[PDB]
Amino acid sequence: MKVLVTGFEPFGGEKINPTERIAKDLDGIKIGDAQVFGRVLPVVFGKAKEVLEKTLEEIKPDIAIHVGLAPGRSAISIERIAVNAIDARIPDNEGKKIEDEPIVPGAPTAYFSTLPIKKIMKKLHERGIPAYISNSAGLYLSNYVMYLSLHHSATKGYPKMSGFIHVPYIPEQIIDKIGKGQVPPSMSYEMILEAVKVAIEVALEELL
Amino acid sequence: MKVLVTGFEPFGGEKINPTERIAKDLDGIKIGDAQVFGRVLPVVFGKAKEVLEKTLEEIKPDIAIHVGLAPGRSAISIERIAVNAIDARIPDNEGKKIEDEPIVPGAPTAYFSTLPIKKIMKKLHERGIPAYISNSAGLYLSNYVMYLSLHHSATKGYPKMSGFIHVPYIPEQIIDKIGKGQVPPSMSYEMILEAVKVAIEVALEELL
Amino acid sequence: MKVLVTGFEPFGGEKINPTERIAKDLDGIKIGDAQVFGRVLPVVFGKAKEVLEKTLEEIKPDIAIHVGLAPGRSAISIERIAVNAIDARIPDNEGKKIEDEPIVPGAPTAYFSTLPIKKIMKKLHERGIPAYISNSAGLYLSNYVMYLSLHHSATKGYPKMSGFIHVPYIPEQIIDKIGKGQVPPSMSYEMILEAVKVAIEVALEELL
Amino acid sequence: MKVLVTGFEPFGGEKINPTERIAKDLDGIKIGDAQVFGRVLPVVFGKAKEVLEKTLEEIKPDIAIHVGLAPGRSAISIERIAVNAIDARIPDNEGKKIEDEPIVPGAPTAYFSTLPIKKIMKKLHERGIPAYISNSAGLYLSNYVMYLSLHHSATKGYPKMSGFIHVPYIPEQIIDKIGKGQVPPSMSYEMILEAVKVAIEVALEELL
C-alpha cells in the first residue's frame, strides 16, 4: 500500500504555503504498513501537470491526497468534485492567467473525488477538527491537479482513490493581513497536519 | 503587584466558554513577582456586577484584564472602549434581555481601556498571534463588565489599568456548527491562553 | 423563438422567494418577437423534476433560464456548472433531506451551462448590475433543476441553451434577520428582475 | 425648522461616494415646513472640521444628520456613539494618517447620538429598508465629523439633535471589485436616499 500526498509551493505573494510543510512532514512516514510519499508541486499551469504525472508514474500510489491552501476558509474542506476547466482569478507563479480553457479537451466535464469524503469529515469531527465538504475547489491550480489526478485514475487504473483537501491559512500568515485592514480565519499547523494524517488513515481503512 | 484575570461561564446555548478555562488556568500563577488571580464571572446582568465588585474589593488588583468569548471573530481582539449602555441581542443566563439602558446612570458615556492595547497587539504579532484592536465590545455582558471595571478604576483609584480581550471560539466548539450549515473561525485554546499571558506581561512591564 | 424562465416557491422558513415573482412578472412578455414563458417550481425533490419535465415538453423552449434564491450572496451569480448529485443541507418543502445520491444514475457527472455566461456577466456589468460566475449552484433544488434541464437538452435536443441564475435576498427579506443577529446582503427586486431580462436578451442575441 | 444633511467626497481610491449625491439631492428640499440644507464635506482631517464648523455656524440647524460610506456594510447603519479619537487605517485625501490622537483634547471620551436612532431604525424596517444600530462609526473621518457635531451641540446648544448614518456601496461601485476577487454587499442609491429622507422625517417628528 502506497499513499501520495502533495502540497503546493508559496503563491499569490504569500511567503509560505502550509501545505508545502505538510507534504515534507508526511514524506516517508508509515501508517500501519502503508508507505507515505510527500511531494511539493509548483503553482504553475503545465509544469504542475508534468510533475504530477511524473510523480504518479514514478510512485504509482494506491491513494492520492492532494492538499492546498484556501485563503479565507475557516476549516478543513474536503473537495467533492473536480471540474474540467481553468479560469484563474490571479496568474500562476509564472504570470500565466488562463481563462475559460478545458484542462483536458474531450475529457469529462467533471470527476467526483473517490476518497471517502463523508467518512473523513466524520472522523475529523470526532477528533474535534472542524471540517466540511466543499463543492468547488476553485478553477486555479488546486482544481487543476485534482482533476488531472482523477483523470489519471480513470484512464490508468491508479490511483484507486484520489481527492483534494483545502486548508485555511495558519495563524502566522494572518499577521501582515491585519494592517491591510482585514482578518481572515486561520487554523493551527498542528491541527491541519493531523487532519491530513486522519484523511490518509480513513482512506486506507476504506481500501480493501 | 497583583493581576486579576476574569473569564465567563458558558452562555447562549454553548456547552463551554474557553475564557472560563483561561481564568482557572491562570489563577495562582506568577509572572515575575506579580501574583495572578483568576476568577469566573456569571453571564448575568446585575449578578455579574456584584461578583465583579466584590472581587475587585477583595483583591484590589493593580491590573484587571477581563476576557470573553466573541463568537465569529477570527483573531484575538483587544477592546479600545467601554460604553455606558446595555442592549442585549440575546438574554443573559437568567433570561433577562435588557434593552437601551445605561450601565451606570449619570456616569460617562464611555471609558477608554487603560491597558497598553497597541503594545499588547504588537507583542502578540511578534509571537505570531493574530490580534487587532476592536472598537466595540458589544453591549452584552463583556462590555458590561469592561465598563464597570473602568468605572471602578476612575472612581476608586484601582485597578490602575483595566481592559477587555475577546477571543474566538476554540476548534471543538465549531463541530456542531457545521451541521447547522455554517463554519465560524476558531483559534486553538493554547494560543488564546498564551495571548492572555502575553497581555498580562506587557501590561505589567508598562506599570512603573 | 420561445424562452422558459422558472422561479421557485418559498422555502427554508422564508415567507417569500423573489424568483417566484420574477417568473410571474416575466410570464407572457415578449423580447423582440421571442415569446417568454414564466413558471414557478416547487422546492421539492421528485415533484420539481416532474413539473420541470412536463413544462419543457409542453413548451419546448429554445432557451431555458432557471432562477433561484441564494441566501447570503451579494450579487447576481451565473452558474457555470450543474453536478449530478444531491446532498441537501436542509430538507426540501416535503421534509426530504436526500444525501449523496445521483440525480440521474449513469448520466454525466456534470454539464456546463450552455448560456453565454461571460457575455451575460459583461452586459450586466455595463448596466451597473454586480454579477459574477459561480462554480457551484449548491446540491439542493437549484442544482437539481439546473442539471435536469441540461440533461434534457443533451438527451432531447432542446432547449438549445440552458442555465441557472442565482439572486440575492431582496431587502424586505433582511428585516427579521437583523434581530437574529446577522445582516446578509440584499439586492433590489427591480435590479434582479432587470438582470434576468438582460440574461434573456443576451441569450437570444447569441442564438442564430 | 432647519435640517443639515452632509455627505463626503470620494476617498480611498473610489471614483464616487454615494453620500455626496445624497447631500446634493437633498439640498433645498422641504419636509413639511422644515428646510433642508445639503453640504458635501472633504475627507480630510482639519479641513473637514473647518467646513463643518463654518457650515453649522452659517446655517445653525436644529437637526444635523451626517452621512458617510461604509465599505462592506450590507445595510443602513445608524451610529449610536461618537468617540474622541482618531486612528486612521488609511490616510485622508491629503495623505494624512493620524494615529491615536484625540479629536478634542480634554473633551468627553464619547457622545451618544441624539437622533432617535431606534425609532429611525424601526421606521426604516416598516418601509422594507434593512437597517441596524452600529456601535462604532470607525475612527476615520465619519467618526471625526460625528464627534465634532455632537460636541458642537453640547457646547453651543445647537443642533438640538445630531447623529451619523453609514450607507453601503451602491451597485455600480461593486463592478471593479469583482475582478479583484471579492464581492462586497451593496444597496440601491434610491433606497439609501429614501432611508436618509426617512431619518430626517423621524427626527423632525421627534422634535417638539
3-state secondary structure of C15: coil
Q: Read off the C-alpha cell for C158.
A: 432542446
Q: Do B112 and D81 touch (CB under 8 A)?
A: no
Task: Chain C: give the shortest CA distance to residue B91, in Å.
Answer: 12
With contacts defined as CB-CB under 8 Å, which chain D residues touch B117? none
Residue B34 host element (H or E)? strand B34-41
Q: Give the Å distances, CA to CA, from D180 to C139, C186, D26, D69.
A: 27, 21, 33, 20
- DSSP code string of A121-188: HHHHHHTT--EEEES---SSHHHHHHHHHHHHHHHHS--SEEEEEEEPBPGGGTHHHHHTS----B--
User: For residues D188 and D170, is the Cβ–Cβ distance under 8 A?
Assistant: yes
3-state secondary structure of C16: coil
Smallest Cβ distance to C89: which of B89, B90, B181? B181
Domain that holds residue C172: 1-208
Task: Chain A: give the shortest CA distance to residue B117, in Å.
Answer: 15
With contacts defined as CB-CB under 8 Å, which chain A residues touch C98? none
Chosen for mutation from B170, B188, B191, B198 (greatest number of chain A CBs closer than 10 Å) is: B188
Smallest Cβ distance to D81: which of B110, B111, B118? B110
Beta bridge partners of C41: C8
Tell me the C-alpha distance between B66 and A126, whole Å: 32
Q: Read off the C-alpha cell for D79.
A: 451610529
Chain centre to alpha carbon of residue C72: 16
Question: What residues of chain C have any CB closer than 8 angstroms to a CB in chain A?
Answer: 80-81, 83, 85, 87, 100, 108-112, 118, 133, 135-136, 138-139
Smallest Cβ distance to C118: which of A80, A100, A136? A100
Task: Chain C: give the shortest CA distance to residue A110, in Å.
Answer: 6
A with C: how many residue pairs have Cβ under 8 Å apart? Answer: 41
Q: What is the resolution of this structure in A?
A: 2.0
Residue A21 host element (H or E)? helix A18-26
Cβ of D148: how many Cβ atoms within 10 Å? 23
Residue among C102, C204, C110 nearest C160 (CA): C204
Instruction: Give the helix ranges, DSSP H, for D32-174.
Output: 47-59, 117-126, 141-156
Smallest Cβ distance to A90: which of D89, D90, D181? D181
Tell me the C-alpha distance between D144 and D86, whole Å: 7
Beta strands in C20-149 (DSSP E): 30-31, 34-41, 63-69, 76-79, 81-83, 110-112, 131-134
- DSSP code string of A55-66: HHHHH--SEEEE
Write the CB contacts of C118 (distance below 8 Å, at least 6 apart in sequence).
A100, C133
3-state secondary structure of D189: helix
Tell me the C-alpha distance between A98 and A91, whole Å: 7
Q: What is the CATH number for D193?
A: 3.40.630.20
How was this structure determined? It was done by X-ray
| Nearest chain C alpha carbon to A113 | C109
With contacts defined as CB-CB under 8 Å, which chain B residues touch D139? 135
| CA atoms within 13 Å, Cβ hemisphere of C52 | 31
Q: Mutual orientation of helices A141-156 and A47-59 as an angle, nearest 10°?
A: 40
- DSSP code string of B166-177: EEPBPGGGTHHH
With contacts defined as CB-CB under 8 Å, which chain C residues touch D166? none
Q: Do C183 and D125 touch (CB under 8 A)?
A: no
Q: Quote the number of domains for chain C.
A: 1
Question: What residues of chain A have any CB closer than 8 angstroms to a CB in chain B?
Answer: 74-75, 125, 128-132, 171-172, 174-175, 177-178, 183-188, 190-191
Residue among A87, A37, A65, A86 nearest A149 (CA): A65
With contacts defined as CB-CB under 8 Å, which chain D residues touch C187? 171, 186, 188
Tell me the C-alpha distance between A185 and B85, whole Å: 30
Q: Do D131 and C185 touch (CB under 8 A)?
A: no
Tell me the C-alpha distance between A169 and A187, whole Å: 6
Look-up: residue for cell 485554546? B189
Beta bridge partners of D35: D2, D30
Task: Chain D: give the shortest CA distance to residue C86, in Å.
Answer: 27
